[PDB]
Amino acid sequence: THWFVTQRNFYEPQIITTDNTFVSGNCDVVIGIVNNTVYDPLQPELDS
Amino acid sequence: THWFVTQRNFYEPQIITTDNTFVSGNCDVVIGIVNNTVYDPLQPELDS
Ligand SMILES: *[C@@H]1O[C@H](CO)[C@@H](O[C@@H]2O[C@H](CO)[C@@H](O)[C@H](O)[C@H]2NC(C)=O)[C@H](O)[C@H]1NC(C)=O
Ligand SMILES: *[C@@H]1O[C@H](CO)[C@@H](O[C@@H]2O[C@H](CO)[C@@H](O)[C@H](O)[C@H]2NC(C)=O)[C@H](O)[C@H]1NC(C)=O
Ligand SMILES: *[C@@H]1O[C@H](CO)[C@@H](O)[C@H](O)[C@H]1NC(C)=O
Numbered sequence: 001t002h003w004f005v006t007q008r009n010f011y012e013p014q015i016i017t018t019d020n021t022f023v024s025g026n027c028d029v030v031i032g033i034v035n036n037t038v039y040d041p042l043q044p045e046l047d048s
Numbered sequence: 049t050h051w052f053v054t055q056r057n058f059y060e061p062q063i064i065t066t067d068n069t070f071v072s073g074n075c076d077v078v079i080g081i082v083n084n085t086v087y088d089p090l091q092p093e094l095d096s
């Protein structure tokens with residue numbers, strides 16, 4: 001039910017964040033792309 | 049006219065930001081260094 005990012009050769013699940021992923025293109029080009037939520041670690045720092 | 053950062057094996061121009069570059073030394077040492085503007089994605093998040 002949940003999506004994670006882990007190193008290729010060892011299962012170690014991490015919360016998908018903007019510090020773990022990079023942005024390129026959009027959803028209309030990538031084949032098989034799935035909807036999820038990406039955590040921004042800067043957002044609750046501004047809110048707090 | 050504009051400066052970009054791209055991967056060396058495939059042209060894909062990106063806006064020069066602090067998340068694409070690292071800081072080391074100053075302008076008085078590097079030979080051939082040029083003037084440009086480095087974008088900070090943190091600044092408009094604080095301003096807004
Ligand atoms: C992932 O989410 C996007 C955006 O919420 C979905 O794209 C929308 O899908 C609805 C229903 O199919 C359409 O009526 C809208 O026109 C779409 N909006 C956009 C921006 O294209 C997309 O369908 C979702 N993917 C899945 C499989 O749930
Ligand atoms: C890049 O910009 C810097 C700073 O704006 C320039 O530094 C100036 O250089 C002139 C001539 O050498 C000096 O007289 C000034 O004192 C410098 N100004 C400042 C604010 O330090 C620099 O010349 C520019 N480099 C290029 C390649 O034009
Ligand atoms: C994978 O293949 C199945 C066919 O068995 C298809 O229904 C599905 O959409 C495919 N998914 C992707 C991401 O290609």
Ligand SMILES: *[C@@H]1O[C@H](CO)[C@@H](O)[C@H](O)[C@H]1NC(C)=O
Pocket residue numbers: 079080081
């Ligand atoms: C590059 O070569 C030109 C000569 O065509 C010279 O004017 C310029 O100063 C040189 N720049 C560097 C960084 O070597």
